[PDB]
Amino acid sequence: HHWGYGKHNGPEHWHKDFPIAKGERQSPVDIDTHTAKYDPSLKPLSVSYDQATSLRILNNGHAFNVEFDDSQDKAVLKGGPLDGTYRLIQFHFHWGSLDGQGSEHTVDKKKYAAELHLTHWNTKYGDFGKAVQQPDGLAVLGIFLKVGSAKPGLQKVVDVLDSIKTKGKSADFTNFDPRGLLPESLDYWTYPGSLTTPPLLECVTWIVLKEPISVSSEQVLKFRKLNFNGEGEPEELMVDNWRPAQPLKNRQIKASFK
Ligand SMILES: NS(=O)(=O)c1nc2ccccc2s1
Ligand SMILES: [Zn+2]
């Protein structure tokens, strides 16, 4: 893999190594709020993070991942559009170089400053690597970030970023509670899609919350001090690590709310 978000290896190039990039259920997408139909058959989302066990935070060269112990049913997502039980494995964000861009999904073409992805795998497939090979293998909970008041529950994340500045660096990151990153409402849109980074597998049920969380300018500024590069290499700030909206094609976005 040599893909990224730079001037020569960005999303518009990914199809050359990952031809599924031009596939029929790629993500992210623009959510046209007027066209998304309310589906009264959709259940409330069940987010059960009470026993979530974070372990580590890693700069992987494209984002930072907060990783969870997913060796048993601790932090799970169920309900909503989902059949069965999906286990939290990691979360990460996508963000911009300025507050006017950064999200992957858009809402009536609005870009948010960032987007949080909580990634979960369907336990019926036994492990993450097998789940990503299935059309219903993953459920990603997407949450928009806007800049305003600080998010207190995010500060522990931002304060560790200086210790994982460059690609390949990790730090212990235990006892982090991802419930502190959720908005008040769990109203959502949902559609079938894909991973938004290579290999872009078409294995994701997307659940995108309508209500953004607010973070402070200072918090997002610290995201933007991370580096895509490794230690000692020329500094490339980790910014604009988002894939743009992809064609909706033959898909319906459903709303959980009127
Ligand atoms: N950015 S994301 O769609 O949340 C996501 N991307 C990837 C890439 C590989 C494996 C899992 C995921 S989950
Ligand atoms: Zn993501």
Write the residue with the smallest CA distance to atom 6 of ligand 1.
195
Range of the domain at 150: 1-258
Helix (H) or strand (E) holding 66: strand 64-68
Q: Is the CB of 246 under 6 A from ligand 1?
A: no
Active site residues per annotation: 62
Q: Residue 239 and residue 102: Cα distance in Å, rounded?
A: 8
Q: Is the CB of 140 under 6 A from ligand 1?
A: yes
Dihedral of CA 55/162/103/112: which sign? positive
The answer to whether 34 is annotated as binding is no
Place of tokens 């006017």: 100
Length of the chain: 258
For the chain, what is the domain count?
Answer: 1
Q: Could you count the other beta carbons within 10 Å of the beta carbon of residue 253?
A: 22
* Pair 229, 60: CB distance under 8 Å: no
Three-class SS of 112-175: CCEEEEEEEEEHHHCCHHHHCCCCCCEEEEEEEEEECCCCHHHHHHHHHHHHHCCCCCEEECCC
CATH code (residue 164): 3.10.200.10
Q: At 221, is the secondary structure helix, strand, or coil?
A: helix
Q: Could you count the other beta carbons within 10 Å of the beta carbon of residue 176?
A: 19
Q: Residue 214 and residue 25: Cα distance in Å, rounded?
A: 30
| CA–centroid distance, residue 94 to ligand 2 (Å) | 6
Q: Residue 180 and residue 124: Cα distance in Å, rounded?
A: 28
* Pair 57, 87: CB distance under 8 Å: no
List of long-range contacts for 152-155, beta carbons under 8 Å, 24+ apart? 152/180, 153/177, 153/179, 153/180, 153/181, 154/180, 154/181, 154/215, 154/219, 155/219
Q: Which residues make Cβ contacts (< 8 Å) with residue 2, sequence separation at least 6?
A: 9, 17
Q: Provide the residue type at 20 as one letter.
A: I
* Pair 256, 42: CB distance under 8 Å: yes
Q: Which residues make Cβ contacts (< 8 Å) with residue 210, sequence separation at least 6?
A: 185, 187, 188, 189, 257
Q: Is the CB of 117 under 6 A from ligand 1?
A: yes
Method: X-ray
Mutate to test the pocket of ligand 1, among 91, 197, 209, 246 (most ligand atoms within 8 A of CB): 197
Write the residue with the smallest CA distance to atom 1 of ligand 1.
196
Q: At 64, phi and psi to the nearest 5?
A: -115, 140
